[PDB]
Amino acid sequence: ILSTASVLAFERKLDPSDALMSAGAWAQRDASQEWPAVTVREKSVRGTISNRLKTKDRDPAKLDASIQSPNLQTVDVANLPSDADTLKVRFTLRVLGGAGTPSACNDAAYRDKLLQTVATYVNDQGFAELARRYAHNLANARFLWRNRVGAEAVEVRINHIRQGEVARAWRFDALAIGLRDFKADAELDALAELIASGLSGSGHVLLEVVAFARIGDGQEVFPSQELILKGQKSKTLYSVRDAAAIHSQKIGNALRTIDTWYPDEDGLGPIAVEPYGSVTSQGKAYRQPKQKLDFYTLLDNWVLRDEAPAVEQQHYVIANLIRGGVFGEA
Amino acid sequence: ILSTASVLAFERKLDPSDALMSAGAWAQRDASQEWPAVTVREKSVRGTISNRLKTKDRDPAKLDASIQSPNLQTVDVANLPSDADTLKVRFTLRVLGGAGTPSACNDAAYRDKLLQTVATYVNDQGFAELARRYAHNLANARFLWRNRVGAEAVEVRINHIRQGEVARAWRFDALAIGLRDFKADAELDALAELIASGLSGSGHVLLEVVAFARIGDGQEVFPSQELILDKGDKKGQKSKTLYSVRDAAAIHSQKIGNALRTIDTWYPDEDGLGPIAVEPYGSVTSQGKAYRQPKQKLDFYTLLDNWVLRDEAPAVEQQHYVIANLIRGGVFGEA
Amino acid sequence: VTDPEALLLLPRLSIQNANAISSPLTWGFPSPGAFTGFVHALQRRVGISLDIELDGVGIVCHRFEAQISQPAGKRTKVFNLTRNPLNRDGSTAAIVEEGRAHLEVSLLLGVHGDGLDDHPAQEIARQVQEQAGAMRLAGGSILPWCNERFPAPNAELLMLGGSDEQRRKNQRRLTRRLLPGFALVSREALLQQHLETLRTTLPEATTLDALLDLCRINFEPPWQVRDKPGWLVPIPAGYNALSPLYLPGEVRNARDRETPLRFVENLFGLGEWLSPHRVAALSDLLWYHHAEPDKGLYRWSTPRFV
Amino acid sequence: MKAAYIIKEVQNINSEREGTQIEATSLSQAKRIASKEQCFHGTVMRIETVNGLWLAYKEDGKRWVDCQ
Amino acid sequence: MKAAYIIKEVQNINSEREGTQIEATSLSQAKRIASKEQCFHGTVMRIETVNGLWLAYKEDGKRWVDCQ
Amino acid sequence: PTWQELRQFIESFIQERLQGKLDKLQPDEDDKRQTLLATHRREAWLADAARRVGQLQLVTHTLKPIHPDARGSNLHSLPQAPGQPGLAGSHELGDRLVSDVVGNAAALDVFKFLSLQYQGKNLLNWLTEDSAEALQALSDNAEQAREWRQAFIGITTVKGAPASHSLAKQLYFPLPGSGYHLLAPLFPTSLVHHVHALLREARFGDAAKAAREARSRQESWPHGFSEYPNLAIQKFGGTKPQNISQLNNERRGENWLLPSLPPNWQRQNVNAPMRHSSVFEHDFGRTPEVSRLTRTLQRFLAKTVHNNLAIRQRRAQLVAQICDEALQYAARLRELEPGWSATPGCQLHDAEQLWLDPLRAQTDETFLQRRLRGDWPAEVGNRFANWLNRAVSSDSQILGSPEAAQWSQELSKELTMFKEILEDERD
């Protein structure tokens, strides 16, 4: 009958690190191993009321009373130094491979059917569309989330790391490679074949990804933001040791932005590979289960009753299994 | 009639300590006595809801209303430093010895019959199949649980400590030794004979195990996660707590012990797993399925009663498993 | 009971999972009965072979790290547990909370007997340390100190000194060796006179109430805290009888059928943690057994202290 | 009698979202409303006052743990 | 019960004068005496012991912040 | 005293449980009220209750807190008082026994039936004594009354042979002559429930919360209160606290263990002086513990002589604890790390030489070892004494009275102690 398992736990593939951000000057990027770090510091802000009123605060007396005594805060800001115009964001990426084998499963025969399904996927077509788009998201510096939106020139240096040294180095222009077109290039296909060899298990792949972004002198960079528990302390930033940093799962969310196959319009561009494929910044969930195109119905129709989906839908399903997660009912 | 004892108990031999982990650079791992420790710190994560709907609330309204309310967490992580690509896990191992005598027994007739049976096993064939597989699980770094699954090169060093100093040094490459085959090597046989001499004698044998794993710069390592209940209030509560002995991440001792007892390849189901841990009613909690069920005659209890009471000595693999349960320890007994 | 002719010092012992639930009323450091049982097992295992009588223990506790965690929004604490294996069907077993802790104690065990002149003192100390290295103290493995800076060796102080100056000198040389800890002694006459004072204040007073009063911190109106002399703790001070003693082969499912069984229950006394030079006599501070089995009252304490 | 309650359905026992507000007669009524309004499978309900004080939570497959 | 308190009324939260001494039963009595003996508008009260340890302060228009 | 009133009370209670069952039945058909009024209304209720008696047991020492698949013996016994003074447990409660119930939880109606106070005392206390009011109220014949009472009084006795399970604990105790006893202990549930009620009174009681608010107002309240820090929680019923006991339903698990902790249970890491500002900060290098200790020293200024005797002995104990913590701080600072010999400079207050005992001898064997063995560096007690003279309040009144002479006397005594212990460091 072959129902789905009661536990399913997939380890995460493409492990990134915490992307450290330091700062320096452009046109000496080749000697940027001793660049001093960007330090999260505190500054005070005072804000007037700017939100909508709930039709009872529209009394001018209460409005002027609220405007006379505004709130005080102490945000955390992180700025470049006054004599530096380049943000260096450095992290390492470890491609694991073995994308079908779950780390936990109750049923055995379901696990054999899933392993056979993934094996025929790899036999029909290797990790070649997925590694191409992952090397695209490494190519343009999408992991620089808000640090990219106004940069003059971004440059991403990816080194393949052997035993203790580089084996094959790359260097891209992250603004030429757009945020919405998965085109072709020689260096992109070489990096895609390296990631393909990593994901299929034919070798150990460790990449070191450095991204220089030319913002400006003393401008504001944007690291990750923690959750908080007169000096209300309304904003807290992430820093590993007196040095700002982007979270690992934020870099992971930027690398998983390959899903160009969702049933609505492609005027938006690629989104993150998620079951019930959703975007927080837009509050909308493409691949709703009312249509037959989310992750769960596609996997349970692929592996139970063998309705093999379209090539792009099984691309999305294997991308979900690369992403990880906990699947299975109770 | 030689009835079973109402109280049976065996002390845990093969006793490991809490596996501290530290960090540093490869190719100066020979001077790795002053490497700094890996510290457990907090980080704040959020994301949407990914699991399956309960089929009666599939409407787009509450779906979009749910992805506009992400869940907010504070988790612990243990990362390597950004200038180090090696994880150094180090723990101490005691092989105690006297692996047949129970720590508690009602019947003296059961006691000397069981002691005679254990002596019959050990002079028939000593601890040389069990100690071979224990030396395998110390050789290939199976105690590095998730810290192993992507490493470029794992090297394990085991030094037998005398009264004050290193009596004999081993050095292995844990990726050349697989996780599912128990072959024969020279140093593996020497280590297995040391564990055999430990398990047979009366004095303890102390081993120091070091395991270097070349992961990468700043990647994530995985210590044990503390089982806590009654967690508290959601404004301050932490979602995932890692183990830390003295401001340094660590794998629990019983996790190292459960890794070292993964020698059981004689269970009747097919070895798509390979070896599993040694338990009475041998159960894999990652698999959620208890092999060696009592309906087949291949669990620990019935095998021990047939080996001691009615003297049906089973196959040599099954008495290997029985003596492995006795080295594992346990509390057995009916009312 | 008996003055020890020698006072052997076990060094700093690393114990990784001790039973932190000392009693049904106290958590924290393990019971003194664990240490007295440890030295009686040492006597049982090498005290016969070397013709000695190991008796009494000096508890020191250099370092204590309990595996607890404070839940968010509560004042009290909970325990970090372990994951049991499944049952034969795959369901999870019902968890029994057992507290663990990581200790670092030094044991001052008093040795006396005719084996002192038969062997050198360093050889008998080395043999008793090799036997201690393969035991367990309160449920925790004794970590045997490998590949550290330098192993701490033992020292059997002969208590019979040539002079009182020599006795005080060698006592001070020992107290320097076990200094960063905190020795634990039993103070029961202090609890008794505190019962007397509290019954002067208010009658029909239990000494459970006196133990509770000396445990807590309590404020007084003029606000100031009420002072306590030293670090007073509650400890389990042995057992008290419930059932009459049974015959050795009579109780069903005993640990042994050669030894009489008796259903007992705890007795909560009062201990104190002092710095080790405060006692000015290390020949005491050892914990002995006091049975008197005819009335129950299987209890431990330290006589000769004050 | 018509007391207001907050119902959050979150990932584990210690995760915070915003939850919807109901109005119920008793806490045993709010335990019955919240079990109906559970969208996903592996989530954990929780019942709150309007200020943030806890009332009860319930993991999936287990029964209602009641603290305050 | 008749404890002595020092009442300073200063310009901002961190300014030091000499303040007058009262004698009051409780700190809630000294909060009530000091609010009567406020000469000026935009000043900040503070209650002290005789040695200098703080008890409470109160900006104008806000309520009593209580540290020690 | 009259048996008719007792019979009416019994019929009223059985009818009360009947109307409770009919109310909690929510029935509309199937005619279950006839079986309810036949089984749960007649005097066959007491017959089936005497049937339910053999599952129950009144206990003060349950086994089930020890690992819950343990089918052993369970006792209702109060021990005799020990002759030795001081220590105590289970022999203090004279009237305040809660008398915990173990057995089948669905048969709790018999316990709530017997637990009432109908005339002046307990109903089991009535049936245990031969009385004319007893043995007749639940009766029309004498032999069935004798049978019902012989059932009802047996709940307080252990049923079966004495036994402890393999998962129960049992511990050898060395007798003074030779041989051992086996000592199976139990969980005292009356003790845990009584200490639990006292702790809940001291922590959540209104009479203590009033003084707790009165401290914040700094008013004068008649009595004080207490705080009990560092409690730990242990729960026995994992998810089903009803299966263990009946008093494990009042306290839902929640053992509320008191702390028995050594004073060095909070790890205080070591801080060594490096620079000049570190030499001024870490010369005393003082924990919050000595701050708490000398703060209570500052509260020992005013004194009347009949109390000032005891205040003086407490001052002696306090300065004794001060020099003990100073010596232990020196011990862990000198034997913990090599940080006293980490980096030199110009200012380390290097006349100390006590916080660097093996730091100047183990590496330099001829340079500073002769500079420490021959000097015997013990002048640090004078600077430490000058550190202590800031703890006394520099008032002219306490200077002019004899309290200054008494204070200087006890400081000189404990300073002599500190000096002579600092002296023998070379051996």
Side-chain angles (χ1 to χ4, degrees), chain F residues 242-259:
Chain F
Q242 265 74 71
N243 299 14
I244 288 306
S245 163
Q246 179 62 301
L247 279 183
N248 214 2
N249 301 357
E250 305 205 11
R251 43 172 187 89
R252 317 154 288 176
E254 287 214 357
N255 206 6
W256 285 12
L257 296 168
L258 306 171

Side-chain angles (χ1 to χ4, degrees), chain C residues 154-206:
Chain C
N154 297 260
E156 176 183 0
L157 170 142
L158 271 300
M159 194 69 229
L160 318 179
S163 89
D164 302 336
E165 184 272 347
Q166 183 84 8
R167 183 195 307 272
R168 197 177 39 95
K169 188 273 295 180
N170 204 357
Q171 171 184 173
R172 197 182 301 273
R173 206 185 68 81
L174 210 64
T175 294
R176 188 168 292 277
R177 194 153 161 90
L178 52 94
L179 190 45
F182 280 97
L184 160 73
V185 302
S186 90
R187 297 202 43 96
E188 61 271 339
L190 177 57
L191 180 58
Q192 182 53 51
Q193 60 195 353
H194 191 88
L195 183 56
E196 295 324 288
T197 56
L198 198 147
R199 213 201 294 111
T200 298
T201 288
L202 56 99
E204 76 267 343
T206 81

Side-chain angles (χ1 to χ4, degrees), chain F residues 120-129 132 134-138 142-217 220-274 280 283-298 300 302 310-311 313-333 338-339 342 344-345 351 358 361:
Chain F
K121 45 196 281 189
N122 190 44
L123 301 194
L124 181 48
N125 210 297
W126 279 118
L127 268 82
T128 40
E129 53 168 351
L135 277 292
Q136 198 265 127
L138 62 177
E143 53 94 21
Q144 79 88 41
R146 173 65 271 203
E147 188 273 300
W148 278 358
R149 184 243 193 187
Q150 193 46 279
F152 265 51
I153 59 155
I155 45 185
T156 59
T157 79
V158 53
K159 306 321 291 167
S164 66
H165 209 91
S166 317
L167 312 160
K169 310 301 196 303
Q170 49 188 354
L171 291 86
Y172 287 114
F173 204 95
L175 291 190
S178 305
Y180 304 94
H181 284 196
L182 211 44
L183 299 197
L186 291 160
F187 194 84
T189 58
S190 293
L191 260 293
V192 174
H193 195 262
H194 186 50
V195 174
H196 187 89
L198 288 181
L199 258 60
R200 204 205 307 119
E201 175 273 310
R203 288 175 62 196
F204 302 99
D206 295 17
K209 197 69 66 167
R212 209 166 289 164
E213 263 160 38
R215 181 207 180 193
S216 287
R217 305 176 213 155
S220 279
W221 189 259
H223 56 253
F225 68 102
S226 89
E227 270 298 336
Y228 290 100
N230 288 335
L231 289 191
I233 316 295
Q234 180 189 38
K235 40 184 60 55
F236 300 107
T239 181
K240 297 183 290 287
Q242 265 74 71
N243 299 14
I244 288 306
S245 163
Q246 179 62 301
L247 279 183
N248 214 2
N249 301 357
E250 305 205 11
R251 43 172 187 89
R252 317 154 288 176
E254 287 214 357
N255 206 6
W256 285 12
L257 296 168
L258 306 171
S260 173
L261 297 158
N264 52 346
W265 73 287
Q266 310 268 35
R267 195 273 311 278
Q268 308 153 256
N269 210 9
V270 291
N271 285 351
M274 276 297 95
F280 321 128
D283 219 342
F284 46 89
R286 283 311 167 192
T287 174
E289 276 71 13
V290 286
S291 175
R292 190 256 320 165
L293 217 51
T294 70
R295 258 199 295 112
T296 73
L297 201 53
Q298 300 260 342
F300 285 165
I311 296 311
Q313 286 104 26
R314 288 218 55 97
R315 277 149 82 113
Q317 300 195 17
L318 257 59
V319 68
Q321 289 177 13
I322 282 177
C323 50
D324 300 320
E325 175 43 41
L327 179 54
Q328 276 163 346
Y329 169 60
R332 64 157 157 269
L333 195 60

Side-chain angles (χ1 to χ4, degrees), chain F residues 374 377 425-426:
Chain F
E425 67 175 0
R426 278 82 50 85

